[PDB]
Motif scaffolding. Structure first.
Motif, PDB file in Angstrom:
ATOM      1  N   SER A 124      50.452  21.668  38.817  1.00 26.01           N
ATOM      2  CA  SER A 124      49.508  22.338  39.031  1.00 26.01           C
ATOM      3  C   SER A 124      47.933  22.167  38.264  1.00 26.01           C
ATOM      4  O   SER A 124      46.975  22.117  38.795  1.00 26.01           O
ATOM      5  N   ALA A 125      48.291  21.610  36.910  1.00 24.73           N
ATOM      6  CA  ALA A 125      47.360  21.386  35.930  1.00 24.73           C
ATOM      7  C   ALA A 125      46.503  19.954  36.610  1.00 24.73           C
ATOM      8  O   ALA A 125      45.198  19.963  36.341  1.00 24.73           O
ATOM      9  N   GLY A 126      47.281  18.897  36.969  1.00 24.26           N
ATOM     10  CA  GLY A 126      46.658  17.791  37.214  1.00 24.26           C
ATOM     11  C   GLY A 126      45.739  17.787  38.466  1.00 24.26           C
ATOM     12  O   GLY A 126      44.735  17.167  38.707  1.00 24.26           O
ATOM     13  N   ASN A 127      45.739  19.153  39.520  1.00 23.49           N
ATOM     14  CA  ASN A 127      45.111  19.482  40.328  1.00 23.49           C
ATOM     15  C   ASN A 127      43.711  19.825  39.818  1.00 23.49           C
ATOM     16  O   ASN A 127      42.577  19.458  40.224  1.00 23.49           O
ATOM     17  N   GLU A 128      43.936  20.341  38.473  1.00 25.22           N
ATOM     18  CA  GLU A 128      42.604  20.800  38.031  1.00 25.22           C
ATOM     19  C   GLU A 128      41.751  19.921  37.189  1.00 25.22           C
ATOM     20  O   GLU A 128      40.736  19.926  37.339  1.00 25.22           O
ATOM     21  N   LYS A 129      42.402  19.136  36.308  1.00 22.50           N
ATOM     22  CA  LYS A 129      41.764  18.143  35.643  1.00 22.50           C
ATOM     23  C   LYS A 129      41.293  16.960  36.685  1.00 22.50           C
ATOM     24  O   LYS A 129      39.918  16.631  36.207  1.00 22.50           O
ATOM     25  N   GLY A 130      41.704  17.036  37.721  1.00 27.54           N
ATOM     26  CA  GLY A 130      41.030  16.189  38.987  1.00 27.54           C
ATOM     27  C   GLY A 130      40.584  14.851  38.632  1.00 27.54           C
ATOM     28  O   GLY A 130      39.647  14.187  38.963  1.00 27.54           O
ATOM     29  N   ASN A 131      41.375  14.066  37.530  1.00 32.51           N
ATOM     30  CA  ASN A 131      41.448  12.631  37.216  1.00 32.51           C
ATOM     31  C   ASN A 131      41.694  11.834  38.461  1.00 32.51           C
ATOM     32  O   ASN A 131      41.299  10.602  38.549  1.00 32.51           O
ATOM     33  N   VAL A 132      42.113  12.532  39.666  1.00 31.07           N
ATOM     34  CA  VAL A 132      42.276  11.388  40.524  1.00 31.07           C
ATOM     35  C   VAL A 132      42.124  12.319  41.919  1.00 31.07           C
ATOM     36  O   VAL A 132      42.191  13.715  41.786  1.00 31.07           O
ATOM     37  N   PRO A 133      41.749  11.902  43.089  1.00 42.22           N
ATOM     38  CA  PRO A 133      41.176  12.518  44.151  1.00 42.22           C
ATOM     39  C   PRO A 133      42.313  13.048  45.044  1.00 42.22           C
ATOM     40  O   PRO A 133      42.388  14.192  45.703  1.00 42.22           O
ATOM     41  N   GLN A 134      43.400  12.381  45.098  1.00 38.53           N
ATOM     42  CA  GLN A 134      44.709  12.745  45.742  1.00 38.53           C
ATOM     43  C   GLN A 134      45.283  13.928  45.112  1.00 38.53           C
ATOM     44  O   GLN A 134      45.099  14.349  43.884  1.00 38.53           O
ATOM     45  N   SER A 135      46.031  14.924  45.839  1.00 42.90           N
ATOM     46  CA  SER A 135      46.767  15.899  45.582  1.00 42.90           C
ATOM     47  C   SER A 135      47.811  15.342  44.510  1.00 42.90           C
ATOM     48  O   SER A 135      48.392  14.505  44.405  1.00 42.90           O
TER      49      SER A 135
END
Ligand SMILES: NC(=O)c1ccc[n+]([C@@H]2O[C@H](COP(=O)([O-])OP(=O)(O)OC[C@H]3O[C@@H](n4cnc5c(N)ncnc54)[C@H](OP(=O)(O)O)[C@@H]3O)[C@@H](O)[C@H]2O)c1
Ligand SMILES: NC(=O)c1ccc[n+]([C@@H]2O[C@H](COP(=O)([O-])OP(=O)(O)OC[C@H]3O[C@@H](n4cnc5c(N)ncnc54)[C@H](OP(=O)(O)O)[C@@H]3O)[C@@H](O)[C@H]2O)c1
Ligand SMILES: NC(=O)c1ccc[n+]([C@@H]2O[C@H](COP(=O)([O-])OP(=O)(O)OC[C@H]3O[C@@H](n4cnc5c(N)ncnc54)[C@H](OP(=O)(O)O)[C@@H]3O)[C@@H](O)[C@H]2O)c1
Ligand SMILES: NC(=O)c1ccc[n+]([C@@H]2O[C@H](COP(=O)([O-])OP(=O)(O)OC[C@H]3O[C@@H](n4cnc5c(N)ncnc54)[C@H](OP(=O)(O)O)[C@@H]3O)[C@@H](O)[C@H]2O)c1
Lengths: 287, 287, 288, 288
Positions: free
Chosen positions: B151-162
């Protein structure tokens, strides 16, 4: 080539074994089998319940109660030995015993994702582990235990159909909406596949395998869910229960088990029988 | 809308976790991911092997070895805490860890049915029980553990994919000929279904689920089977290995993992990727 | 060489490909990615003027060769194969992407009586039916029958390490049990999807791999209207009619699929149904 | 009443049924069991003289009513429905069993070069193709569209407790990936099988259940030759081309299926694919 229902679908002289045969779906099976001519060993963990049903529910006194833990490799050994003593063969093994999973992971529209992990992570590792021992491991060893008895029923030839093992799966093996826990569904998917693999191996040896895949049926598990249904808009009953507007019943189960166990079903191997009232066509599935 | 391969398929800045990432298939994945721009935690039970591969195999020093038992609910808790400390998020969980089942039930044309039960009944109840803890239970808790990190990787948004979880299933989840034990196959069928159920639940929360379903690949499990293949008439290699005349390799696995983890695969959820060389089309299956 | 590098794995340099329906919608996104990443791509359509625009305007290296034909017509296929057998001599990849929408869908609105819904059902024209099947199934079969020498030749020229391959654009409608089109569209896609699995079973041993791309909702000429309609949907309806990721697909999604399966990366894939749906299938009743 | 007795559960007394292709092969075994166990059965074929023999000779109670028609022709269906709407007013069960064999199968003998196998593949006639789909898929659709009022009426007359129902004879060829017929037969059966699941999804909520019978090898007019050929097979080939139980199916097998699904026993079944194959599917590459 008599095509009369009484000739096709009778199970006279059929020797059958039904795990979980004293409640719910398993009960509707043994009542159908015994009323129409069979000797049905019922195997459960509660010596009562098996007893109460052996008396009271039989119509010819051919329900033989026989306590055992169908998942325990050693109880199976003693149950097989007993049936080898008292009868010498069986024609039909029905692996119907089942447990509900861990508590379902609730996802209410007002649950944050942070809350839904709280749920997900709470699940106990020994439960989600056991449902697999009852539904998959337990089915495997039930087959391993009765395979001599099933091989013998082919030799005694008291019935023209082959010896057969039936396995109670679930439409949860295909339903993609986790209505229970991901473990119930995952175990049913696993046992359904193992069943297809066993029909691939053992039909050539004269043991056919088939799966009954039930929708919503009034059992000890569903006792509460059935009570809850009385509180649903028609369009909800239609999607959570059946678009035909009822859950299943004694006669539905009687039809399935009597079709696949008689000479009518004598050429069926590898069939997944979906008796669901049409529900599967309404929820996301993989059937 | 740059459609260049280097723009579509790079995984630069992707933070990934691969269980079983130090041998066989899992290794070919982390080598593909790290060589093309990613930080790949590899999780295994052997502290060595994880180490040897972190050095030696990396090309940019982005394989971070991290010992743990992916099936142990408590090792997952400590592994998650560490990655929350050192990095704060992940974008991709790859549940690749796997064990071979109990010994396969051998059915040689010169085996009587009496002998094949001897085999069937010998199977140990604790093994056929464990394959299910690694392949199914272990996958579930791996997801439950990393869900905050995902869920955090979606927030950091270092990548455009989910954020995404990939699960290494098997074509044994569909192959009906028990080439291994009915438990390997049954567990893979179970985890494959759970994966489809999780994509049904959690894609709306922005965690996509996909399954890679491998045919025959040179790993530590298949080490012997691959040696045995050198002794097969072409028409056998074609049916037991691949009609294209080879098992898979680093580049095949690299293609799959790089497709589904990059922006190219950013819209894929619920796909079962069958990388089998065409074998499944040749054996009895349910795909 | 074991180059696990995106530019080495996924390039299609020197690949000779054929894409029916390659000048609009999904087929266009395929040729634009194949050609931009090194391939020579024949696009086959009936509207020759649409093929010419795409070939002049959408190429980045001038390797889109327009070639008018009716991919369902057994005789147009014969003349197309010949042109390629002369101008080029082989192909490596046939992509059967051409498709039509079915007859008009049968409207089942909550305020339709069953008497009204038959009125709908019975109105369906027997020729629109019998026709969607000729494009999607019959048309795919004969496309394979026509290019099979050319596909066998690409294995011999060996300009690429991967096997010759035929890809077929199916649909998630081949598994979705709620018909959003006519029962004829879905039924034809189910039929072609199965034929594709049967061809991989037959012909991978001869070195022609078969795979299916199974698309969810994609902006094409067929979906234009449906895409316009989506703009008036509660998030929850959009998540179910379109995708729970909150968008339909795009050029890059299609580029990923076709580039994965046509390159050396996909060289060991045969019999795969690639579901690129945004997760929709997991939300509607299906049989996947 | 909860009579769990074979004669109470499985009788079809008073059931009004329609069986296309009801005068030969599988369809015949269905009508003989429905009529012997209490039903009035319309059989629909094109060869009127074959319908008349069966109706006079194979009935045991004189309840086989022969009725010539082309089940694929949208206009013959219209005239058939009317006859029944007058003579009887309702039906309870439509059985879409009519079927044709495909084009000639593509021979792939170990001593066929790939050059020869295209010769085969390309020879297939575009009309035999486009035609198997009209009988098996289009023909099933319009059969349902035509009888839907009659099926809706049987729910109202309530002469039987089970819902009105349509059964469709598919094939295990809808899942078998090795084509033993032409890719067109298998592809049409896959298509109709899927349409059947889509119709159960739509119309069970309106009280018309849909189910598919998926037969293995059965002695009919289509399989006559294949059955003769079986007599020259090593047990191991017979176990794989026919059934590991060592026989093809028969009257009683078909009687069981149709009697289970048409009676009150099958009254809660919708969306089931009944695989009566002798176990063959488990032995060949499939997708079931
Ligand atoms: N009812 C439904 O709607 C529905 C839907 C889908 C699938 N199913 C499946 O239907 C099957 C039957 O369950 P049910 O619905 O009839 O529920 P139920 O009324 O609770 O019956 C379950 C039975 O299983 C027996 N059992 C459990 N573990 C056992 C073991 N280790 N050894 C021996 N017997 C054991 C229980 O007997 P003891 O407690 O005395 O051991 C009990 O009689 C299950 O496999 C279930 O998954 C039911
Ligand atoms: N290779 C094939 O042909 C093939 C075919 C179908 C499916 N698969 C699947 O591919 C996956 C990868 O296996 P492989 O073929 O690459 O074999 P492998 O070389 O033996 O890799 C298996 C890896 O799993 C790790 N592992 C096992 N249990 C673990 C646990 N509890 N926690 C953490 N790591 C664990 C092992 O690391 P440690 O031993 O150090 O813990 C090992 O590195 C498996 O899921 C397998 O079922 C492979
Ligand atoms: N778009 C989606 O969301 C979606 C979803 C699922 C599946 N699909 C499938 O994708 C395919 C179509 O892609 P699309 O949606 O991008 O369609 P599109 O925008 O309408 O373009 C399809 C192309 O097919 C060509 N075509 C049709 N019949 C042909 C024939 N007989 N011979 C040659 N070319 C022919 C048309 O060119 P001419 O008319 O000029 O010949 C047209 O350019 C079909 O298989 C469709 O079912 C699309
Ligand atoms: N036999 C098997 O082993 C087997 C296996 C799998 C599936 N099936 C399926 O079973 C069905 C056929 O049963 P069968 O094998 O018993 O076939 P069969 O013996 O050849 O009889 C099929 C019947 O279909 C009728 N028919 C064909 N087209 C028709 C049309 N347009 N309108 C009306 N009637 C039509 C024919 O009667 P007229 O020609 O006189 O009209 C014929 O009596 C097909 O769906 C077939 O694919 C059979």
């Amino acid at each position: 080539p008599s095509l009369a229902v009484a000739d096709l679908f009778n199970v006279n002289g059929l020797v059958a074994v039904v795990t979980g045969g004293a409640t719910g779906i398993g009960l509707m099976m043994v009542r159908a089998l015994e009323e129409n001519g069979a000797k049905v060993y019922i195997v459960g963990r509660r010596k009562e319940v098996l007893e109460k049903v052996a008396k009271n529910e039989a119509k010819h006194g051919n329900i033989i109660p026989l306590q055992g833990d169908a998942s325990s490799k050693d109880d199976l050994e003693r149950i097989v030995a007993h049936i080898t003593k008292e009868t010498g063969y069986i024609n039909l093994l029905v692996a119907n015993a089942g447990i509900p999973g861990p508590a379902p992971i609730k996802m209410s529209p007002s649950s944050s994702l942070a809350d839904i992990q709280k749920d997900l992570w709470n699940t106990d590792p020994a439960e989600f582990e056991h449902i697999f021992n009852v539904h998959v491991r337990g089915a495997y060893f039930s087959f391993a235990a009765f395979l001599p008895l099933l091989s013998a029923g082919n030799e005694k030839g008291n019935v023209p159909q082959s010896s057969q093992m039936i396995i109670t799966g679930s439409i949860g093996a295909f339903g993609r909406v986790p209505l229970a826990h991901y473990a119930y569904s995952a175990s049913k998917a696993g046992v359904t596949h193992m069943a297809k693999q066993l029909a691939t191996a053992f039909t050539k040896y004269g043991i056919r395998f088939n799966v009954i895949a039930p929708g919503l049926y009034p059992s000890e598990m569903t006792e509460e869910i059935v009570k809850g249904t009385h509180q649903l808009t028609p369009d909800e009953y239609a999607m959570k229960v059946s678009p035909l507007g009822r859950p299943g019943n004694d006669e539905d189960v009687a039809g399935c088990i009597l079709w696949l166990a008689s000479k009518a079903g004598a050429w069926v191997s590898g069939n997944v029988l979906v008796t669901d009232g049409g529900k599967l066509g309404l929820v996301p599935s993989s059937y």
